């Protein structure tokens, strides 16, 4: 509601996505100008600290890693290259470049620090690659082939509760949850409710709750809320939030109070919070 410092990005195109760090001192930003820029916003002062240009095509997503492993920043892209940057003594350098995909990599999401330094990459070839840094040596790659028939749009890991699980949504109209069994990523659930392409899926960071909640926005506009009271049962119940007329793009949960931020093609952000009785109600409308 209140207006703090407004940043000047010195960019040349539409910033497709952004993401702040764990402690809220920095902001990564990615645009269609093949450039990932790092901004140090401290005490209301916009300071461009780094400009990382290593892609051949547009950059779609940027994800910060947990503080304990250092300042690790992942950036996916259209050029089938997942570039992992790392800050050493104030200098950002490319440490690893995974080029094992046939089409555009659309999403990157780090695993909870408990599991390790795992990164999931969803690409338009219908494949999810799991990169793993063991501390010593290179990155072990586990590629889940034919995950989605057409392509994979978004990936998001479950809060650590340790059974490693992550949810992925694709253009095949199906939201799929994955689970690591015996060291192998196997398909766990198939949630079907959308009539069109799933654009983004994000697993709620459930705090003090037995229930697990996942949100999924789609092309048709219907935002569904998937809830499973018991993790063992794996019975997921969907609940329509609101059918937006314009294509909903991505969904994001708040860390502390689980408030969903929904953005549609109408250039507006609608905040939704579940009430005690159960009905979801919009609390504010923050348009561009």
């Amino acid at each position: 509601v209140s207006v703090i410092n407004t940043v000047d990005t010195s960019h040349e195109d539409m910033i497709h996505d952004a993401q702040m760090d764990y402690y809220g001192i920095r902001l990564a930003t990615c645009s269609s100008d093949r450039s990932v820029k790092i901004f140090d916003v401290k005490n209301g002062g916009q300071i461009l600290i780094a400009d990382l240009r290593g892609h051949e095509g547009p950059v779609w997503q940027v994800a910060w890693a947990h503080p304990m492993y250092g300042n690790i920043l992942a950036s996916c892209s259209y050029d089938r290259k997942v570039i992992i940057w790392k800050e050493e003594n104030g200098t950002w350098e490319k440490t690893y470049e995974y080029t094992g995909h046939d089409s555009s990599v659309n999403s990157v999401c780090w695993a909870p620090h408990d599991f390790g330094l795992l990164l999931a990459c969803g690409s338009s070839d219908g494949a999810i690659s799991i990169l793993t840094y063991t501390g010593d040596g290179p990155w072990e790659v586990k590629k889940i082939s034919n995950a989605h028939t057409i392509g994979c749009n978004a990936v998001s890991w479950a809060p650590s509760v340790y059974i490693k699980r992550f949810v992925s949504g694709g253009c095949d109209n199906l939201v799929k949850i994955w689970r690591e069994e015996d060291g192998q990523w196997k398909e766990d659930q198939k949630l079907e409710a959308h009539s069109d392409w799933v654009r983004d899926v994000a697993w709620a960071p459930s705090i003090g709750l037995p229930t697990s909640t996942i949100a999924s926005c789609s092309q048709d506009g219907r935002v569904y809320i998937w809830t499973s009271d018991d993790a063992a049962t794996n019975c997921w119940t969907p609940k329509l939030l609101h059918k937006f007329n314009d294509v909903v793009w991505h969904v994001s949960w708040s860390i502390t109070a689980n408030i969903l931020a929904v953005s549609g093609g109408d250039n507006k952000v609608t905040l939704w919070k579940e009430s005690v009785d159960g009905q979801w109600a919009c609390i504010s409308d923050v348009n561009k």
Binding site: I207, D229, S275, V276, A281
Partner: protein, 132 residues
């Protein structure tokens, strides 16, 4: 139709039923139920619907269909408190809704202290999920 109960807010309507209409020796529950049936019609709805103190200004226009709206409108915490005081069959969740006292759904102080008092009164029908 000489309605004596008219021009009175829900609280005063129940109070009048307790002293004047009912005998000097009566139980609270019976009076409450009678008042409830009074606005639920019989036969005219002479009593007033229990409305939150902020929603009173614009009582929903009951054009030919009052009941289909009453089944979505909330009631002030006091009614549910009286009901729980009488019996153990009621939704604690409705009772503990932030909107009832304050329109915004972000203020929770009262709700939380009330839940603590209810836990301390040996009344814990609330599900783990909602508590959390």
């Amino acid at each position: 139709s000489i309605n004596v109960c008219s021009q009175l807010d829900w609280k005063r309507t129940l109070a009048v039923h307790l002293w004047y209409m009912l005998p000097p020796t009566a139980t609270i529950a019976q009076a409450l139920r009678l008042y409830e049936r009074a606005f639920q019609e019989h036969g005219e709805p002479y009593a007033c619907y229990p409305l939150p103190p902020y929603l009173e200004d614009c009582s929903i226009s009951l054009g030919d269909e009052p009941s289909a709206k009453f089944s979505s409108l909330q009631r002030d915490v006091c009614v549910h408190l009286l009901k729980l005081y009488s019996e153990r069959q009621y939704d604690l969740c409705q009772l503990l809704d932030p909107s009832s006292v304050t329109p915004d759904p972000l203020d929770y102080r009262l709700s939380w202290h009330l839940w603590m008092v209810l836990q301390a009164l040996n009344y814990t029908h609330l599900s783990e999920h909602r508590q959390g």
